[PDB]
Amino acid sequence: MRILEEDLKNSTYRIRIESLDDLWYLRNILSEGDEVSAITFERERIPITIRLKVEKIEFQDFDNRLRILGKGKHQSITVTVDSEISITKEWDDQHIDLLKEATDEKYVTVYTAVAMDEDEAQIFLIHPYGIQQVGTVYSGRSGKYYSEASYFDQIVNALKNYSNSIIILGPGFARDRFARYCAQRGVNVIGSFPANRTDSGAVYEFITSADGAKLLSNERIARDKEIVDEFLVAVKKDMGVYGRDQTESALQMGALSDLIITDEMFRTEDGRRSLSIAQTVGTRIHIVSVSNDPGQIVKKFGGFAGILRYRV
Numbered sequence: 001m002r003i004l005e006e007d008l009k010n011s012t013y014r015i016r017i018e019s020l021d022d023l024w025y026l027r028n029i030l031s032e033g034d035e036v037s038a039i040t041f042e043r044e045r046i047p048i049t050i051r052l053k054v055e056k057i058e059f060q061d062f063d064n065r066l067r068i069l070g071k072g073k074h075q076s077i078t079v080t081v082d083s084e085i086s087i088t089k090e091w092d093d094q095h096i097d098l099l100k101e102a103t104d105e106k107y108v109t110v111y112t113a114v115a116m117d118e119d120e121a122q123i124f125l126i127h128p129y130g131i132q133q134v135g136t137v138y139s140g141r142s143g144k145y146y147s148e149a150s151y152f153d154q155i156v157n158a159l160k161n162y163s164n165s166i167i168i169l170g171p172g173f174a175r176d177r178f179a180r181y182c183a184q185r186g187v188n189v190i191g192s193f194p195a196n197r198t199d200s201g202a203v204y205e206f207i208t209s210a211d212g213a214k215l216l217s218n219e220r221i222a223r224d225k226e227i228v229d230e231f232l233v234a235v236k237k238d239m240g241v242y243g244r245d246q247t248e249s250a251l252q253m254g255a256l257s258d259l260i261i262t263d264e265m266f267r268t269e270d271g272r273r274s275l276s277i278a279q280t281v282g283t284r285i286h287i288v289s290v291s292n293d294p295g296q297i298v299k300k301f302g303g304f305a306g307i308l309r310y311r312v
Helices: 021-029 093-102 148-160 174-184 200-208 210-216 220-236 244-252 269-281 293-300
Strands: 002-007 012-016 035-040 044-054 062-068 074-079 084-088 111-116 120-126 131-138 166-170 240-242 256-262 284-288 304-308
Touching: 012 093, 021 062, 021 093, 035 074, 044 074, 111 148, 111 174, 111 200, 120 148, 120 200, 131 148, 131 200, 148 174, 166 174, 166 200, 200 210, 200 220, 200 293, 210 220, 220 240, 220 256, 220 284, 220 293, 220 304, 240 244, 244 256, 244 269, 244 304, 256 269, 256 293, 269 284, 284 293
Parallel strands: 111 166, 256 284
Antiparallel strands: 002 012, 012 084, 035 044, 035 084, 044 062, 062 074, 111 120, 120 131, 240 304, 256 304
16 A cells, blocks of 8 residues: 555545555445545546445455535445545544555565465465465375376466465475475475465464564464464463453453454444543453454454453
């Protein structure tokens, strides 16, 4: 994301979408009734009171449903890479952060991860907020025992359409052989790290490992993982709290050191309500995104979770 200009007086920022992921960020930045402005076409502007946003994680287009103000009837703005937008609203800390994050290369890097066996390789894109399965190459080895080269070859083809640093994962050294195979084709990798299985789980676990940390411990995905794990360990050790009621409850009595709520519940009034209470009470805040599995966990628990402390 790129910030073109701003108007402090009217709480506005003009941002330019540069990547697909920028849409995900835009989506989290926009809310209920914000005022958005765009130039449509012999150029004409279109200011709007947002009423609904249409966007699915990993999409390439973003739709702002609305009511024109700059007349009166419903209309719509379609955001895509290269689009420019003026957003007016009250910018709380969470939203300002989304902006600082979207525009910082150090935080939005995308990696291509290949978790492979001797007979199967799954490719994923590690977005700064979640994992996106993007294919699967079977070696067929069982059915042909066969040249591992044409399997490795299948993997390289599936990777041609992407251009991010590569991380190779997997159980038995098939990863090492493949990394060596890629070096001969020019294609160089950060890669090759052991992993129990060959599924998404492997990617998250890599995120959680020493090497994973050195690489992306600051990205959202890694952060949401870190806290939700703490919570999971918390609940096991009888120091955790889940569910709106129970959590809000423990929050109110300054009995919890960490308040974990979801992406979704933050767009909720209780959500925003509890965040401030949390600041009053002296409790750390954590907004986990349902766009990754750590978020999914908290979602299932109700969207609210907390880690206990001796009543403050």
